Amino acid sequence: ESADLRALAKHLYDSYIKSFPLTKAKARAILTGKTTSPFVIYDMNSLMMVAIRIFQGCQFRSVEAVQEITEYAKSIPGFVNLDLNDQVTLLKYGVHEIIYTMLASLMNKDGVLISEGQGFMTREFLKSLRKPFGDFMEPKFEFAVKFNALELDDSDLAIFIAVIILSGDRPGLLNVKPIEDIQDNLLQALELQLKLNHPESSQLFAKLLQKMTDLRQIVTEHVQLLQVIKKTETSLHPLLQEIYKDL
């Protein structure tokens, strides 16, 4: 213990560096201009240089991200030993929550990096898209500004998204006992990592744990928002289709 909790934190950090193209450390340096500059999209004209266009182009990276999160999951110790049915359940209910955590790293009060940092879409432009598309991103922006004020780094985020994947209360899970015993161990790694990485923030663990329920409700409110589109807006990628069905 403890020495082994630190080994697991390093293992997850390594895996996370290997699976995801844009770290929070790079994204922040791009957002602050400290890097040695992305194209800025603020209207239709700067985009082509419409809400459906954004909406469908967003599916592109989303499909790729489910693949990256799935690979990161397969590296979580114990994960590939679980019943393969429960592996599907954890990824089905976790991928969107992980997208929104990683999306926060690419966000500030004023907009969001896109295409691995080669672009910056402004919050004003997103909020100005025709209803109901204009409201899709605002709940993500208000969660991102609160979550970024915790000031986690990638080494913290590696264990945090592992904790999100291994949730024992997902619907349909066949055998929760082995899932819960991995998460308890990851929660222990996260608690210790935050003590080491932020010895000054007394209750950062407690603050962080409460964000996990915030994510769950962004996904709930997103899904309800997307049902209206499908009803009133006449495509979706089959892998997004398979994740959203009965979700």
Binding site: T70, V88, I243
Partner: peptide, 14 residues
């Protein structure tokens, strides 16, 4: 049946 109702996801896991 989870792996049968999620063929793309199931294949990304194998």
């Amino acid at each position: 049946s989870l792996t049968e109702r999620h063929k793309i996801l199931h294949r990304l896991l194998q």
